Symmetry: C3
Subunit: 104 residues, 3 copies
Amino acid sequence: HHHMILVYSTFPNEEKALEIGRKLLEKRLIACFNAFEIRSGYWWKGEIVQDKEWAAIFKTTEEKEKELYEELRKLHPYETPAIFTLKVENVLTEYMNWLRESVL
Amino acid sequence: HHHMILVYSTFPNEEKALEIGRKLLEKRLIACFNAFEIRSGYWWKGEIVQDKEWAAIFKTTEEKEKELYEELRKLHPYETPAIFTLKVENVLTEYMNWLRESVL
Amino acid sequence: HHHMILVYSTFPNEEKALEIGRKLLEKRLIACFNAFEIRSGYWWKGEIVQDKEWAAIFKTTEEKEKELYEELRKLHPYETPAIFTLKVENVLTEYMNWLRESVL
């Protein structure tokens, strides 16, 4: 009975990404984050902009999804941040056990 | 009623990845891209090769999926590019609203 | 009839990530890997730690999933590695054909 989720967001810089990751570990809402640098593009005020951001995947259980969204929402510098959940199909047994323990 | 998708592809270099991202924003087929550098490996002509590429995730709505595949297909330098769609489970409400508006 | 999967893991460094990718191509258990550098955070022995790792996505068919997990399990330096599978929804036809051929 795997119950893992993967939530993705982006952040304006490395420091903010890692700061939020750490706060989310402190609040036991995720078991792990993986962050990396990205280049981004989107419309902003009628122009296509290029930006430099940090992305993060947050690994946690379904049970924590609500609390995680609401905490990321409160911590997020962006007025409308990208926060979304990918579907996980299977997970190594030992790893799922460790995930669950890490967010209890 | 979330209707977001995530499409992934890889590109031979940073410039091509960003160039295509921008063209896809211009054609309103995606709301956002996030690109990053990757190392890759695969079989090519009977050998295992290591390569250096740029990956991109393209965020858009289901409604745009067909047009997006066909546009990436036409723009893609690779004869057989990796283009595939990940399933998104949930999405922050404000963000889904902005996604939809960005591709209208 | 797409039958592609995406399996994710993390590794202590670039060399190990690429070494395992290559061994997995040699054993024909994946068609392709894409690896990239990440910063990570998790609990370890009662503290929140920051780490520097390499992530990899491994692209393959459903048919190879079992063999892939068991091979990554045997090769993985971590005692409890993150190994999990994302659900793929659609895939470019030509690309799915190449995936299948690459792991036969």
